[PDB]
Every structure is written in structure tokens, then in C-alpha cells.
Symmetry: D3
Subunit: 228 residues, 6 copies
Amino acid sequence: VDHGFLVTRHSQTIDDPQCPSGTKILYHGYSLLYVQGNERAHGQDLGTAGSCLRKFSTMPFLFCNINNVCNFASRNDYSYWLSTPEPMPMSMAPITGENIRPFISRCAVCEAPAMVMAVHSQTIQIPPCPSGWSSLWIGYSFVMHTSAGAEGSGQALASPGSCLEEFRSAPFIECHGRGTCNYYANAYSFWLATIERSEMFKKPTPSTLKAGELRTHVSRCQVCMRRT
Amino acid sequence: VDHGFLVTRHSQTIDDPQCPSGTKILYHGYSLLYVQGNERAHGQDLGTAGSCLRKFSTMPFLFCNINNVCNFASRNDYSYWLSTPEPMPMSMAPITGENIRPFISRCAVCEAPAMVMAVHSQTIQIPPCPSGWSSLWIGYSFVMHTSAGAEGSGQALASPGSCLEEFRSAPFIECHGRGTCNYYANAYSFWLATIERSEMFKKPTPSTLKAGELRTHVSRCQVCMRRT
Amino acid sequence: VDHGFLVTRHSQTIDDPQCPSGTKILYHGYSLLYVQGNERAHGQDLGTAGSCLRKFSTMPFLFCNINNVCNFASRNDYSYWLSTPEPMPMSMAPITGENIRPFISRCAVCEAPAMVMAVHSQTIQIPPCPSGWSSLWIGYSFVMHTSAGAEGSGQALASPGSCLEEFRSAPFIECHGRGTCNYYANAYSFWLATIERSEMFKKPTPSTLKAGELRTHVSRCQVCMRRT
Amino acid sequence: SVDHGFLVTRHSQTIDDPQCPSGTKILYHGYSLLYVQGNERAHGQDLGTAGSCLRKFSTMPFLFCNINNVCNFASRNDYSYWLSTPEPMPMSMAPITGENIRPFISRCAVCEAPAMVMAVHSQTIQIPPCPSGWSSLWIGYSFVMHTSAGAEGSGQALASPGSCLEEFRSAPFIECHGRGTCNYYANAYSFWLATIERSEMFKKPTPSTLKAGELRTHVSRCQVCMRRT
Amino acid sequence: VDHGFLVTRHSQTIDDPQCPSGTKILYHGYSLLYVQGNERAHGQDLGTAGSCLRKFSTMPFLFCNINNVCNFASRNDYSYWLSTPEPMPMSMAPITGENIRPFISRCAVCEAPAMVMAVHSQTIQIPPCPSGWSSLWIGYSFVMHTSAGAEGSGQALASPGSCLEEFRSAPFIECHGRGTCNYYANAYSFWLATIERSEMFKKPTPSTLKAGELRTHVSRCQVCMRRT
Amino acid sequence: SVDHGFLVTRHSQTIDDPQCPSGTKILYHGYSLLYVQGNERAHGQDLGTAGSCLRKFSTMPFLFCNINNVCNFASRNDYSYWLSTPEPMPMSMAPITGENIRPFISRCAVCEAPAMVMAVHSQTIQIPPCPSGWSSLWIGYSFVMHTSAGAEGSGQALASPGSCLEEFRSAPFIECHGRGTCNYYANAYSFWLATIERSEMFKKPTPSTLKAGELRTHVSRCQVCMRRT
Ligand SMILES: [Cl-]
Ligand SMILES: [Cl-]
Ligand SMILES: [Cl-]
Ligand SMILES: [Cl-]
Ligand SMILES: [Cl-]
Ligand SMILES: [Cl-]
Ligand SMILES: [Cl-]
Ligand SMILES: [Cl-]
Ligand SMILES: [Cl-]
Ligand SMILES: [Cl-]
Ligand SMILES: [Cl-]
Ligand SMILES: [Cl-]
């Protein structure tokens, strides 16, 4: 008996990701991370179908007031999408129109025969799946993010959405109602850090890491599914 | 075998909603959207039992400090509830006492034999349920809301709570610890917008819509349950 | 057939909690409530495995910027953990190193045969589980919390995380990247309040409560699992 | 008598330049800037000071720069806010652009004064008298703060002429964007000092909801005054 | 020639403060610190006449919307006033009506012959006035404050408002539109700290201070006027 | 002539003391404080006022007290922000501590003036002339606001000398912490008044992204002026 358990997967590229072994495709879409309306951020759990929308837009929502008037793309609102490895233009100027497409991640919504969860090692080692559970994928421990106005959202640490397959310092792009997208200097990604068991309660040693050593302090994860 | 999957439904009226096809009643209540304490908003997923409380109050919570003192209805805190089609009084003054009753939406918490999800078309078209899933209800794509201090919360786009059966410009009412409720000019509802496939990457065309044309730009949704 | 449903339980003590009736242990850990990075709070549902981390740290995360530079414990960021009955030191000075250990709650992540939920009475009386659901535990209705910058997070009222077995005016402690933990005067806990059925729509009667009468206005809850 | 260079700014709340009040002299005119909002953070100008009077209007009067030595102008989602005129919203209620913005923007004068200038507030429907030895520049209504997008905003110093607006307006300011649009939005709030009777100071305030024809019954009055020399 | 320079003084008691030597009285009032409307704080400079209102109220302002409707004391807004040495009631419950009077500070707005400024020692010693400037009063260096929502305001360090004559850990009280006032556990005062010249560019030594030793780390100030 | 005690503060944006402008005399020197952030809320000092000039630097120049009569100094996660020098970030990009912080911190002078001091802004690349009867103190770039941690920050009064920085810097301030560290962070933004053409005031602004070598092509100029006596 298939009960309709769900798992969402994000390619972090322009390609449709395959559903992991033992699961089946329902539909593909574009990777929505969060929206920002009237300055207030609201995010989707990356492990859930709500992060996977059939249609992209820089402005995928509208707002309505108590006077029964609705406004679409008519203020200063934002959308944020998981992004591909596509580099910023040399100009560093905002991206518009069809030029936006190579920057947006794709996703799969998959039906699973059992419950799906994430486990985190908090080390450079891959955490094993709990006894009785098999592996769907391995990745990096993704916890939260901020951009405009230091607003943002985050992930549930037991959800597959907290286990991104590709580590990226800049895993999302910012888009506006006016039709532009860009990366901005205030965009932060937050990842679970590595911790040695002996050192749990001791003062953390501050570290600043550069390209080539970023993942030396990033926790690893595995997305697992109950064997039936 | 029943595993205890749940779905919550909101009437957006004074009457109890009926449980959708193939599900059974657990209990009814009043439709809690969010609370705001010490200026900070915290919302409930409208698809979960947490948005359905047995008892209403303008102040359904209290707060406690590190000095072991608790305070109930003794500051400037808020509660927010899904509302009915009841219009504002002519006076536009705050509503009190038994006069609040006609304004508050009812809900049903129902047990389901399988997982329940929402899908969104992002068009005026009704999106079909995935193959193998049956229809529970059809509605309008509800994403987030803001009120006092531009604080608020939103819905999980995979949850039944992101699919409201009646579109309303003003779908919720603001209540206070002091016992008053009202609609305020800064109350905003946010809904997923309609997008044309060929125009996904193009600049959104701004639109200001009035009564009669509001739903011409509102995404449709369907709530679905795996057939067993 | 075991589908891999999950329930997380928090001892609110230095000891591992036992898995509730009819469930089995997956792993134990420390009780993570929320994190705060670049001043923005992000919480974990206390009913989910995300609130149960194998390894403690005052700084369990790092951040990365668009210039491919990551920083660990190198700004002014926070972590928050459910706490034990351990009193503040007489000095009221921040706690460091091994002295932190007696303050941090433990958790168990447990595999269940069926779905788990919480129900709330909104009275001093115990709410019964729905028919066909078995009792896992009884507690107090925990909704929301705030600390530094009045930032915080909250619980899903349908989740076991909204049902804490021991009432505490101060149920959580604040930790910092610099390695210190403490209770601060601005730490607030929010709980569901008691409501009389006949008085639902009436003006709430304000009340200030001291030690000995704190629980007289705190809603009770029960955590329930579908009988299979 | 030495002129030390005391300043007072006046706002017409119309498309026409205001005149400098009696006993003061014009320095320059401009447009009435209320506040700006960059990276979601509001920062306001005291309406009594020359900082609220800019020579050139724009929907985007500022740019931002980052630690990587890159600056961006009108290239995100930032705002500017200006005191507005009696011009009504178009019936479409759609954002205003280009030259259609001009009728909505208030004008200002920066004036040199021979002495210090202050505002006083009655907290009644009556005009408060100037202090002994001070003469009147203008009368108006007690303006304290305002909010718009994200409930961000700013306010006035109650001793400043900026807290004393000559025309009462439920909606005294308009919102503009980097993209070139301006509009009134349903979340735009103006805050004014209320009328308080001396007998009711330490009594529970009586809640009141007021409509057109009735609004100013609860709005505090003010006078802007200048020391006689 | 008297040019009309102003200085405002706060008694921090129920008594009218006297205008300092060389100055003359214009009027007296009650000490307004800040207001909070639609959750946004806006403060008055304590050295200026704007912090001295003729009439007290728990709600000294109203708000108006774009529909030409104004609301007075009809939501959840705040006012904050400098307070007296009057202790919190034993009950710790909100204070109403005439009972508020013993808690509210008084002020004087005074005309001065010349400019007035504050200087700060950043030591426990009184800083001398600049040469050519004479003393108005001495005090403690007051910088900022926070209360509900961790909103607040602060003082200009060149203003007499940054130099409070009486040190208080809780120098202000919180009032509400509903007519209640109280001290709350999240109310913070911030003061300039004592810094020794040779320790300026060293790691600050953390310190937690109790009653009897609070002022050992509080910077002193003097308010001065140019001799003419 | 009677000296009434008008004040003007100047910031070197270097480790050298700035000189008081001609016509003014020194009161004292110090370090350039921009703003503080306590319990996550920012509060700034007007850079034109003596409040922005503290005798003694510290990474933590304040403490906080609670209603239980307990005060805490450098015992949470609070911040201070200071105007900075041309000193580059170290190659490691790691937090700076101890005496190594000194090369990064700007110095300031508090000066007594015989008359009122103001700023004017051109909103072009040209220097705006002082008003009639006002003499020049310095020229600079129009600085309006700034943000850092939590997108909190503060700004300048556009009539104040604080809105007129003598040296343009994309990163004009550094962030320090109660724990004793300072650094530049990727989210630190500076906001400057932009150049506006008179013919383009009401038109849609043209978006621009500028790199090193062209940053100042869109930054407004200013002059700080003093009334002649
Ligand atoms: Cl928009
Ligand atoms: Cl940027
Ligand atoms: Cl309340
Ligand atoms: Cl309203
Ligand atoms: Cl840190
Ligand atoms: Cl504290
Ligand atoms: Cl912009
Ligand atoms: Cl609107
Ligand atoms: Cl109110
Ligand atoms: Cl409290
Ligand atoms: Cl600190
Ligand atoms: Cl950084």
C-alpha cells in the first residue's frame, strides 16, 4: 500500500533532477526558496512540494487590501530562488528577461513508499542512515539564509531540504517585481558546522575560510528512507 | 490500516465545514491564523490541527519571565483569526464582546486514510491532482499575510492551508488582549499570481485590480489525497 | 509494515528521555530550540528530529558570503537550547566551558508505527486523545518564545513540540559564538491560556501571577498516536 | 544686531513655493523630502531643517556602495518618501510615473532667521500661545511620526517647526520607488498629537474612531515661534 | 541680545526641576521619552523641549489612514515616560488612572543666553567643562533604551539629554493606549561605560554588576554653557 | 563680538587629528563614533555633532542594565561602529584585535564656531556654492545613511556637516564587538546622495552599476558653510 509520502529534490542546475531510487516522479518545476512582501519574508521547506513551482516569475505573487483592491508587481517586493553555478555577468549589473533562465534551479516532486528524513554528522564524514533506513542522497547541512533587510528563512533539520547535494557559498538569487535578478553583497548562507565530540562544551575556535578550504568546516548529511 | 493522517478545513463562515470526501471528523473549532507577542508574529499552518482551536479568545495565550512571573492580557499583544463575510460596522470602530462571534471562521480537523497535498496552477486553470490522487477540494492560492508592524506569517505551498476555498481581499481579523477586534488599513493578504508560460522570464506587467476583476490574476489550487 | 513515522521527546534534564509507549529509539541528542544569525532567528519544531542534535556547541553553525569566504564563530551570533532545572550561578555572570553541560536538555528521536499529534484543552483539565488514538504523554501548551532583539520562534500546535512535559517560566538558555551562555531578563516564554467556554467572546480579565499560581492559567495538552 | 545664521524650513504642502515667514529671508527653495528607505531600513529628515528640502526631486535620490568597491544606483528595491499635495489618487489607483508625479510633490523654502525658532503644542483644539518674548511665524497641527512599507518610518522633533504642519492631512506623504513609480498605499499611517483635557490626563483614554468632517476634533494644535531681538 | 537658546531639564521625580543658574523658565511639563505606533518607535531628544509635554496621557497621539479615518486609543500602541524612584507595586500588576501619577517624571523648558552641551569622561570622575564654558549640572552618561519588541530610541551624546542627573537601572516606564502602565522584564537602559586610556585597544573585561556596584562602570558627564 | 558657543565636528577618516576649519578653534579631539547596536537595535550619532567624537575608543563603549538592578558590560553579543581609515583588510580576512585595531579607526575634532554651520548639496558632480553671506569650511561627498549587522543602521541630517564626508569611501566604517574583535563584513552598505539632472527629475531613473574608477561619477557633492559675522 502506497500512502503518498513525498520528497522534493533540487538539482541546483538547469537540469530536471531524477527522483531517487525507489521513488517516482509526480512533476518537475523551479526551485522557490522564499518570498518577501511588504518587507516580510516567508519561506518554503526545500524538502516539500511547496518549494517546487511549475512556473517561474520574478513576481509570483500579488497583494490585496481591505478596500478590495489588489496590486500585482506594483510596489517593491521580492522573490528568491535556488540558483545554478552560472557566473554573474562581468558588469555585475542586474539580469533581466530570458537572461534569467540559466540562473534558476530545477526541482522534482517525488512520491515515496515510506517516510523520508535527513540526518547530520556535524563532521566532514557522511552520517550513516538509521538502522532499517536506506540512502536516497548525500549532501551538505543547510540551515538558513538572509538577504535584503537581513530578512530570510530556513530549513527543518529533519527535512531533506536541509541536505543540499551541492555546496554553494551563494546558493540562491534575488529577484524583484520590476523584473530584475542579481546577487547582492549582503546575501548570506548558513550551514551546520563541524564539531569534535571532545570539544562540544569548549569555546569554539574562530575560523575564516577561503576558496579551497570552505568545506573543511561544513557538516555533511544523508537523506534516508525507511525500508518496507 | 489507518495511520492517522490529518487534514484541516476552514469554512470562512460561522458554520462548521464538512470533512472532505473519504475523511472523517475528529473535532471542530475556530480558525486561528497567528499570534503576536512582544511584537513578534508566530503563525499556524492552516492545513494542520494547530490552526483549529476548540475555544476562541481575543487573548488565547500568556507570557512568563525569568523572575517566575506570568502576565495574562496585561500588555499590548494580538491574536489573528480567519474571518467570515460579515461586513465592518458603519462606525468602523473596534468590535467587542458577543458582537465578535459573527466575524470568526470555523474549522474541522479530519482524519484521512492517506497523505494529503496541495498543487497550484499559477493560472486561472484548475490544476489536476497527480495521477493516483483523488480530489478533496478546489480553491485559491494563499501564500502570506501582514498586519500590525508589518508582522505576519504564511502557508506551506504543499499544505491544504495554502488553498482557501473562498477568495477574500481581507481574509482575517485582528484581535487584542484588551478585548477588541477590527479590520485595519494595513492588513494585507498575499496570493500566488497568474503567469503565462511563454512570459515566465519576461518583465511582469504591473496591474491594479478592482472588485469584479480581482480573481483574474489569482492562481487556482487543488487539494488531493493518495488513493488507497 | 513500519513506514518510519517519527516522534521527538525532550527530557528538560541532563538525562536521556525514554521513547514513548509503542515507539523505538533511533538516537539521542541535545535539545536545540533555535539559532540566530545576522540578527535573524530560525527555529526547529520541537516535535521533529531537527530539534535533536547529536553534538552540542554554543556555535553549531557558520556563514558564507558571495565572495566565497566563510566565517565560523567570528561575529555576534547565537544559539538557543531547551534548559534543565539548574539554577543561575549566584554571580549571574555568563557560563562557559564544561559548566554549560548541566544546563542543556537532552532528547530522544523515536520511530513510531503511526502519526503523532498534540491536542490542547485551553483549560486546567487534561484534553482526551481523539477516539482510536493512544496516549504518549501529558504536558503544558507551549506556543512561542523571544529573547535577544525580541527575535524568536514557536511551535506548531498540532505537533508534540507544543506539549512540554514540565512547565518552566524560563524553559530555554541563550548561547553565543564567543562561548558564553546565560539567562537574560528579556527572555519570554509564551503558553496557551485557560478560557471558560461561556466567556470566550468576553473581554479577557487581566492577571499577573506569581510562583505558586503560575499553572492556574496554563492550558494543558496530551500527545497522541493513532492505534494500529 | 549680528546675524548668526539661524535656519527655519517651511513646507507649502502644494506645488507652489512657500514664502519665508515674517522676519526671515530666503536662501533657496526645493522639494519636501520626508525619508528614505534603503536595504529595508528607514532614515528620516527633520522637517524643520534644511535636510528636508532638496533642490532636485527624484524617485531615487540616493545610491549604495559595498565593501567590494561596487556601487548600485536604482538597481534593487529601495524607496523615497516626500510630503504631498491635495492632488487625489487617479481613479485607477495604479502607480504614478514620469511627469504625472509632479502634481503630487510638496515644495519647501529654506529661510535664514535672526534668532532661534521653536514649536509649541497645546494638546487641545486651541492655538498655544508663543512663550513670553517670542513672536509667531505660523500656526498648524501637531505631527509626530509616520509609517509605510514594512511599517518602517521616522518622526519629528516636537520642539522643531517640522512637528507643526500648516495643513492637516490624513495622508500627508507619498511613497516613491527606485523603479520610478509613486503611489499612496493602504498601510501608510500618519501620527498626530491628540487633544487631552487636563482633568482627563490620568484617566483611561476614551477610544474614538473619527471620519471626514470630524478628524480635527481630536488633533493637537501648534505654533511656530521665534525669539524677539 | 538673547537669541533664544533652549535647555530642557528632567527631575526624575514628581517635583518640577529648577532651571539651572543663568537660565529662565518658559514652562513645565511631563517627561516624554518615546512613542511606539504600529510597532515602530520614535523618540524625543531629552535635552530638547520636545521631551517636555504640558499634558500627560498613556495615549498622547492618534493615527490616520489614507481612507480619511482616524483612530485614537483604538489599537495596541505605546508611550514611554521618564520615571521616578516609586517602586513597582507588590502585585507587579499594571497601574491605571491616578495611580500612574507617582511614577511620572517632571520637566522644565528653560531659555539660555548661549549654547548648551554635554561632555562625557568615560570614567567615574566628572569631566571638566571646556575652557570658556560653565557648569549647569553633572550626571550619568545615558545613551539608549529598549522595551517592547526591542524597539526604542536614544540620546545625542552632545545633548544635555545624554546626561541624566540620577542614575537608574530602570529610568523609564511603559504605558498603553488601553490606559495601563508598568515596568517589564525586557526593559533595558544603556549607559556609556568606564574606559581607561591604556585599555582602549584591549579586549574588554566582561563584568556583571549587582546593586551596590552598578555605578563603578558608569561614565560621568557634565552639562555646560558658554560664558557670554 | 560675543561668542555664543556654536559647534562643528570634523572627521579626518585617518589616524591623524583633523584640523579645525579656519575661523574656528579647538575644544578637544577623539575617535569617530558612528553608531552603537545593543539588544540588536541601532542608535547613531550625527557626524556633525560632538556626540560622534568620543575621547576614548573601545570595541564596547557601553553597558546595559535591567529592572532587577543588574548591569552587564561586554557580556552578551553587542556592537559598536566607527568611521574608518584607508587601512586595508588583512589578507586572512580574519577579525582584527588589540593594538592592531588602531590603524583602522578615524579621528575627530570638536571645534567652537562664531556662527551657525550648515551643509548644502548639489546633487551633481559639481561643488554647490555656499548661500549668500556664508563662507566655506570644507567640501566633500553627500553621505546619507548606512547599514551593517541585521540590516540595522542609522544616518545623517542633510543640513548637518555630518552629511558631508571629505573622503569618499565605499566602506567608510568598521564593525566592532563586545568580545573585542573588529572587521569589515560583506553586508556593510554605505548610502550616498546620487547625481540628478534637472531635466530628468520626474523621469524613470536610469539604473547604473559602477566599478572602481567610476564610483564618484554618480555621487553628489557638498559644501560645509558658516555664516559670516
Ligand atoms: Cl513589486
Ligand atoms: Cl551589492
Ligand atoms: Cl495583552
Ligand atoms: Cl486603520
Ligand atoms: Cl559568532
Ligand atoms: Cl539581562
Ligand atoms: Cl532601487
Ligand atoms: Cl495598497
Ligand atoms: Cl492604542
Ligand atoms: Cl514582564
Ligand atoms: Cl557584548
Ligand atoms: Cl562577511
